[PDB]
Structures are given as structure tokens and as C-alpha cells.
Amino acid sequence: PASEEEFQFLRCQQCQAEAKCPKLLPCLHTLCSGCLEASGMQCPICQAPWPLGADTPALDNVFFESLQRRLSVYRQIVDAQAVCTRCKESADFWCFECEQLLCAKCFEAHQWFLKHEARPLAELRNQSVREFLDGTRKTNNIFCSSIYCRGCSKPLCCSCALLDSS
Amino acid sequence: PASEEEFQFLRCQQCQAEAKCPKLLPCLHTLCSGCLEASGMQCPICQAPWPLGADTPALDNVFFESLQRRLSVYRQIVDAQAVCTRCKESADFWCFECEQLLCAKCFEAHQWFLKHEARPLAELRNQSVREFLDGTRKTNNIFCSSIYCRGCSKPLCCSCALLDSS
């Protein structure tokens, strides 16, 4: 399994992320990428350590999709698509062209902001970089209501400067 | 000519750059990308408006290769390779794997800093994004003596914060 090694690089749990440690975050402190996953980013409930189940490997909660959006921010600035890593990731059935979201409402929000960051099927198959460059230059949009952040719920080029910690 | 349109996007003159205007620069003010090309970035000589010839379309001067390095910074953070745009760009004969430099000494410097940002032939042919992601995560190096800047002549993740204007 060639592309299977892409996540074995970190033994990721049904997710994909190239950076083992973000140099900055909207949360309190920079730590191992799994630290904010081991315990919810902003969830004060006893479910924050996901004793009942984690959302990123399988949809569990809307607030725990904050982790999904956190990973999706990095995948938006530069996309380490899990589909190329794992074409079986299409089991979600690809409701929309943007990755690292679920329940169709984060997708609908990316649409509301006309800020899809769509990874087309041609991009999912990893055969081109022209569309990648297009999406990259589009990372800085000129419309609103640059890339989404749930805390403020608005496009922000890098909410790391905000330190939202919603 | 499919890939020929990539530079016709801006009618570029024997060069490649996706951003028609950098949102920030090490120079004085943000302007059209051609403004700093019409007149040298830091050259006070009467040759700054390249009446004798421009360096970016064809090697003319070492100080005018500051433009080459400026474009190469953007192409390093995200690479709009002219080779995919124009496979004839290999006429340089590909002395080394990094693009947007000449005279082999900027290349030797990228090597000195163990900071090649090499675009392998597999990447030149535009068939993969895994090596791109590798080089991207390597954009932030852990060695020195992150990406080169001639003014200080040292790796800088974004010399825009420095406003070098050497």
C-alpha cells in the first residue's frame, strides 16, 4: 500500500495531517497536533476527551467538528488530501468538493461565503498542480458574507493572529 | 498551446509569476509586480530601468538577479513552475533542481544553506503533489549556514516582515 504510508508517517487515526505540530494556532498554546485532539479544542463537557467517541474519525458532534475545521484550515492553505492518501476516503460519497468537513453544513457555510476551496476530482486524483495554484491564489478571497474559522465564523487568512480559542 | 496560456494570463516577459501584485514585499511599497521589474529593486545605477537589457528574461547582472530571487521566494512558498508552463524552459539545461535562478551561484547558495527547495523532474512534469507537500513542509527549515533572501543573505520565512530593501 503505497499511499497508505502517507498517514502511517504519523499513525494517524482515520485522518490526515502533515504537520505533527502547528507552529501557531487559534487556541491557547502550540503543542503536538494530537494534544488538541486528545481533548476537545474548546469543549468544557466531560466528553472533551472523547470517551464516547471522537468526531474526526467519525462524526460525533458539531462542536467537535471544530477539530475538523482546524485540520481543514491547514489543508486549505496547503492540501494533503486524504483521498490521494486513501481513495477509500470517497466512502463519504463526496457531497461537495471541499474536504475535511462533514454533515454538509460546514460545506454549506463554505458555500455561503463563496469560499469553497473546492478540490476537484482531477485534484483528488493528484494529477495536476495548476488547479492547486488557482485555489492557492484564491486562498485570499475578495468576498465575505479569507478562509473560514468557526470561532468568529468568518473568513480569516490566519486566525492564528486572532488566537480565537472559542 | 495549452500551457502557453499560463503566462499569457499576464503577458509575462519570459518569466512566470501567478500574483500580479504581492500583498507585501521586502521593498518599500506594495505595487504591481512589474513595478519593481520596470526599475531595479535596489539598483541606483542608470541601468535600473534596464535600458541595456533585463536580467529576468536573460541573465544580465548579479544585482538584477535580486528580481530573480524575489520571484523565486514566491515560487518557493508555492511553485508556479515555468517548466510545466513551458517545458522549453529546460533550455537552461537544469544545472540544479531549484528554479528561478541563474549563474549557478544562487544555486550554490541554496545548497550552502542546505535549503535547495529542489523541484525534482517528477515535480517539473507536474504529475504529483506528494513531493510538493514535502518541499512545502520543508519551507520551514531547521538548519542555517527559512528561505533565502539576498538582502540579509540568510534564510527568512518571510522577509516581508523585515522590509529589507537592500
Author numbering:
A (entry chain A), B (entry chain B): 46 to 190, 201 to 221
Text lifted from the article:
Promyelocytic leukemia protein (PML), belonging to the TRIM family, serves as a valuable model in this field. Within the nucleus, this 70 kDa PML protein molecule has the capability to assemble into a super protein complex, known as PML nuclear bodies (NBs). PML NBs participate in various important cellular pathways, including DNA damage repair, transcriptional regulation, self-renewal of stem cells, regulation of p53 stability, cell proliferation, apoptosis, and defense against viral infections. The RING and B-box domains are zinc-binding domains.
In this study, we report the cryo-EM structure of the PML46–256 dimer, which encompasses the entire RING-B1-B2 domains and a segment of the CC domain. After multiple rounds of 2D and 3D classification to eliminate heterogeneous and incomplete components, we determined the cryo-EM structure of PML46–256 at an overall resolution of 5.3 Å, with the core region slightly better resolved (~4.4 Å). In our cryo-EM model, each PML monomer comprises helices α1–α7 and beta strands β1–β7. Unlike other TRIMs, the RING, B1 and B2 subdomains are folded together, centered around the PML α3 helix, resulting in a PML monomer. The RING, B1, and B2 domains are arranged surrounding the α3 helix and are distributed on the outer surface of the PML molecule. In this inner α3 helix, residues F108, F109, L112, and L116 form a hydrophobic core, intermittently mediating the engagement of the PML RING, B1 and B2, respectively. The current cryo-EM structure revealed that the PML monomer, which serves as the basic unit for assembling PML NBs, forms a functional PML dimer via two α6 helices. Specifically, V123, F177, and L178 within the α6 helix from one monomer interact with their counterparts from the other monomer, facilitating this dimerization. Additionally, two SUMOylation sites, K65 and K160, are located on the outer surface of the dimeric PML46–256, giving ample space for PML SUMOylation. Despite the prediction that the CC domain would be a long helix, the density of the C-terminal CC residues 236–256 were not visible in this PML dimer. Furthermore, based on the current model, the C-terminal S221 residues from the two monomers locate on opposite sides of the PML dimer, facing away from the dimeric interface. This suggests that the two PML CC helices following S221 might be positioned on opposite sides of the PML dimer, resembling the arms of an octopus.
